[PDB]
Write a protein that binds this ligand. Sequence first.
Ligand SMILES: *[C@@H]1O[C@H](CO)[C@@H](O)[C@H](O)[C@H]1NC(C)=O
Lengths: 74, 814, 91
Amino acid sequence: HIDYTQLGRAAATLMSERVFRIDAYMAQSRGELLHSLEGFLDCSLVLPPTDAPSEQALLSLVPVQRELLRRRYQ
Amino acid sequence: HKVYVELQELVMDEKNQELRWMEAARWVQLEENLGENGAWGRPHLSHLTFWSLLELRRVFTKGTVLLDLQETSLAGVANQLLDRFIFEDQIRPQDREELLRALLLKHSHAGELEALGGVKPAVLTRSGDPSQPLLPQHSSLETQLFCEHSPSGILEKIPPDSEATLVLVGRADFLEQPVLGFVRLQEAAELEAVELPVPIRFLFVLLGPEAPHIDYTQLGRAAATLMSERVFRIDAYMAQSRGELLHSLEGFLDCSLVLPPTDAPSEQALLSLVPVQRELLRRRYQSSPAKPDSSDDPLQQTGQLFGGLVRDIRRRYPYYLSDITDAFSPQVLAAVIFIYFAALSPAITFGGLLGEKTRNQMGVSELLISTAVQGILFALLGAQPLLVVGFSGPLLVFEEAFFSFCETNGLEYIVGRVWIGFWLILLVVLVVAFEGSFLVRFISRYTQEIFSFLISLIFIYETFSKLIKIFQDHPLQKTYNYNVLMVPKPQGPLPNTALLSLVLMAGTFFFAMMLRKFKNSSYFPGKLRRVIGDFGVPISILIMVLVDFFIQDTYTQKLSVPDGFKVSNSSARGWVIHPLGLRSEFPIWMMFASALPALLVFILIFLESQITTLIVSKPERKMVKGSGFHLDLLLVVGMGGVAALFGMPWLSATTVRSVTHANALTVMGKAQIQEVKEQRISGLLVAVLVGLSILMEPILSRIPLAVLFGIFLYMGVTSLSGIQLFDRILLLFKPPKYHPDVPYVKRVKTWRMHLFTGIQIICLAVLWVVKSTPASLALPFVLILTVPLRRVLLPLIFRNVELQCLDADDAKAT
Amino acid sequence: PLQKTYNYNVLMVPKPQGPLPNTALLSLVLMAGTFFFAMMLRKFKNSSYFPGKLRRVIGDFGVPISILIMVLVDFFIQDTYTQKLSVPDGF
Ligand SMILES: *[C@@H]1O[C@H](CO)[C@@H](O)[C@H](O)[C@H]1NC(C)=O
């Protein structure tokens, strides 16, 4: 269950957020980075394999993403 | 193939402190939640959370599994699960007595929410009393977003014979770690917890204490989402131990697509994930024995005599009350008003033309009465009340040719038509007896699009020809005589007629287009805006009649109808025609040779009727109810024959008028066609009004002929929207960069569309030139010769995938 | 204005004396056509129906194209009189 390319992609995705990089700049220890990482993963959603058509399912996820972002920037 | 899943929580009622089981969400291929009011929210897909699924996996790697439990009641299942929990040292022996009392508790549905005043989350304690959670809570996401009739739809969506699963969640402060229990019954059995009659097969039980990053509602949602999938359900039907369930769960998570939060998400980049999910779905069915889901007939050969007729009767007639009732909207009235003019004007024009063609043997009153009769009868006894019958062009040329041949041979005209009708009756009875209409299945989209485009083009050209005739009647000169008599018709030119007619037509068309565009605008309250835009055509007509009625001295051509219920030529005709002979005996050779024109008439009527029925009753135009073919053909030919017995002409369904009628009774969604209003009242109203048109001289005496030209142009332009051949012709000029995302653009090369469209347009050009040729009667023949071309020639030039992609029976699906 | 009868023995040398049959309606037709064509070409400039260079150069001269079309149209018409522009003869 280890593909290092995907791990590097995940690390890049972490670094791609504004809030995570702000916290990393302001960080002084490892606990703060862990707290920022858990806060980042708290606002992520998983889409299970559903038999619905792709287009409607992909356009239906906009409001939940808006809710997650609105809770993220609070 | 589908089950029912119910989420249950341990809650406390506000009135008096006690605990009970409350339903929280239901799953029938979709998730539905309930709010604080007690009303379920709108259907939506399920989106779980990372922590919930993570903890579900963690607790499921060591949770116990009970397979083939032989129990029917709740008490035995609870006792067995508690015994298995005790056996594996997961729960202490001193906790079972409290847990059994907690679990065996009353279950209340939504109907008892308002009776108790609402429910709140509760936490069981060691004593047994309800308590508030210690960790802080926040409002749930699904009930806050989606929650802010249905039970019947729930009742049909559940399959008649299927099983159900129930999932139970709850927090307990006297426990060490969360525990999961999964039990599968030997035989599906009813339970008192669920009021629905569906039997229960699987049972989940979830316990544990409070801990950060665990939300029990969300983990229950995750479990329900896992259970909802067909592949995992089949795996549960075939699982023998926990290892296969673990492997299935790992596979389910492996082919799941998780996306992280971003800063400014956009719908353009987000639509780049359309293939990826598909691929993951394919992987989910790469290792699955099943197959993915998202990737009776009106016509069928029957071994019994007259099977199609009774099939159509039984399929159609049970909708009679709904068809009668569905006509209470003003849109039906507006459509009736529109179709009234749209049907009277060609009727008047053709009646006049036939009047000067056959020396008034056939006139206007007879055909209008016949039109009313065959419209009312078809509206009362028809299967598809959206068709509009009327006279056509090939019928006119056939009548002219028949009259010319009879003049050459010296025979009568109104007498031979009786035997023509008799032979048509015999032929139609023979054809319906052998139900030989199944040949309509051989006609693909190709010829249908060709026919529709050529008919619309001919309509537009005829309108422009009439307008150019209006100019040619009164040219632009410097001097005009004012001492001219105009009682039959104005002799000599007039100063300001043609320009006024052109201005009136331009005003009609411009106002119609502006109202049509304003209908889809956002300039008013929805009800008032839709009502105002619904009457655009009558509004424009009324405005123009007021405007030109205000003008006094200038003359414009007006509508004319015959004065009364009189035969066209009373000198040599009567109300009843003697079949044996009026003035001369009818020769034996003539009746024995009258079979030949009947074949051509039947072929023409047959082809036009089925192609029109195919065009109007496409599945794409949200046509929910079926369309019959044989009974409608029987009706139209029967009324045509009976009218020919009385001397009135036979008619046929009109393509453009029926298409416009269908478009008028179309409700669109905010675009997408939401639905189509189906009813029979419009035909009755149109028939009654056209019959009563003789009684409305003062109204039709003030309507100019030039105003209806704009209406005709509007109909001709509007009836070209659904055609795909026109879209391909428009794409013949666009660069390949701006082409849409339809499959037949990406799958084949651009010059392949150009070659296909070029072959088709050559076919249309041949049809037009043979139409202009005096041997126009051979026009239908080449049309059926188009049938082999798609079946033989095209696979010799293109490939099977390309030919299936272009000449597709369905538009969206290819 | 629009009447039923007009005198045809009218001098037209200094300026239009008396009513005339077909002047006002043809003038209105010309105006409506010019406005409609100008708007149609302005919209077609922003369309996607041609190569960008050709589309932009064609749309760039929309107003003169409409003007030339209409001057050809009324120049082809012979008998009716329409008001024209007049300028002083010299400095
Ligand atoms: C009616 O028919 C007769 C003989 O065909 C003819 O002489 C007469 O002119 C007709 N009446 C009309 C055309 O009004």
